[PDB]
């Protein structure tokens, strides 16, 4: 049963992001052919994590998301044993070598206030940065890590994705599936 959102995801995002999203869903036991809105969300958040990592200097960010669960936990062990930072209870998405903290990036369909609460509820010392499909962002202690142009590029891409879905009538189903 091939959905329209599955075919849109493969045309909307780059193949390396699509393949990483598939492996991430097959691990943890999910099907991109069925949980197709979730398939889109993983690709979206993966692309945001990659753009974020490209916003700083060359050696600034270590990327944790998009890895196998074991090697992602391997890299944070090495980070924490090199930096002397607390090992996070849950896997974060990035590490900032310049500001010496982990980052949990969020991409949300609701308003940025509510998700940060939920994200901070499950969190203690790692930095938190939320993006929305409506252009809003919220970061821990109002420190948005990157400069304005890099974040604005991420917001523009998010709104383009929402437009492309709406143009095919997939947005309403994607908005109310979170
Ligand atoms: O890394 C994360 N989870 C570890 C892998 O879990 C998986 C579970 C099922 C399938 C694939 C992976 C992590 N999870 C989450 C959220 C809220 C907490 C649990 N959750 C998920 O299950 C959904 O995943 C995401 C939701 C939106 C954007 C990116 C995501 F990935 N949001 C994040 O931003 C995030 O980075
Ligand atoms: Mn993650
Ligand atoms: Mn995240």
Rounded distance between C-alpha atoms, residue 38 and residue 43, angstroms: 9
Token pair for 36: 């197709």
Rounded distance between C-alpha atoms, residue 76 and residue 88, angstroms: 8
Q: What residues are annotated to the active site?
A: 119
Question: Please, which experimental method was used?
Answer: X-ray
106 CB within 6 A, ligand 1: yes
Cβ–Cβ under 8 Å, residues 161 and 12: yes
Closest ligand to the CA of 46: 1
45 CB within 6 A, ligand 1: yes
Q: What does this entry list as its resolution, in Å?
A: 2.2
Rounded distance between C-alpha atoms, residue 46 and residue 48, angstroms: 5
**φ, ψ dihedrals at 153, nearest 5°:** -60, -40
Rounded distance between C-alpha atoms, residue 131 and residue 155, angstroms: 7
Distance 31 CA to ligand 3 centre (A): 20
119 CB within 6 A, ligand 1: no
Binding residues: 45, 65, 93, 104-105
State whether the Cα torsion 148-150-151-153 is positive or negative: positive
Domains and CATH numbers, the chain: 1-178 (3.40.91.90)
Rounded distance between C-alpha atoms, residue 137 and residue 128, angstroms: 11
Distance 39 CA to ligand 3 centre (A): 14
């Amino acid at each position: 049963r091939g959905s329209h959102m599955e075919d849109f995801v493969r045309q909307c995002f780059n193949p390396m992001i699509v393949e990483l999203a598939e492996k991430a869903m097959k691990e943890y036991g999910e099907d991109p052919k069925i949980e197709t809105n979730k398939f889109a969300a993983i690709c979206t958040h993966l692309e945001v994590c990659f753009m974020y990592s490209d916003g700083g200097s060359k050696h600034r960010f270590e990327i944790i998301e998009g890895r196998d669960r074991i090697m992602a936990w391997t890299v944070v062990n090495s980070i924490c044993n090199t930096t002397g930072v607390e090992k996070p209870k849950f896997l974060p998405d990035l590490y900032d070598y310049k500001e010496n903290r982990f980052i949990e990036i969020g991409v949300t369909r609701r308003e940025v206030h509510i998700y940060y609460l939920e994200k901070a509820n499950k969190i203690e010392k790692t930095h938190i940065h939320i993006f929305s499909f409506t252009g809003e962002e919220m970061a821990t202690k109002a420190d948005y890590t990157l400069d304005e142009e890099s974040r604005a590029r991420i917001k523009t891409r998010l709104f383009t994705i929402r437009q492309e879905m709406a143009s095919r009538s997939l947005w309403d189903s994607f908005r109310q599936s979170e």
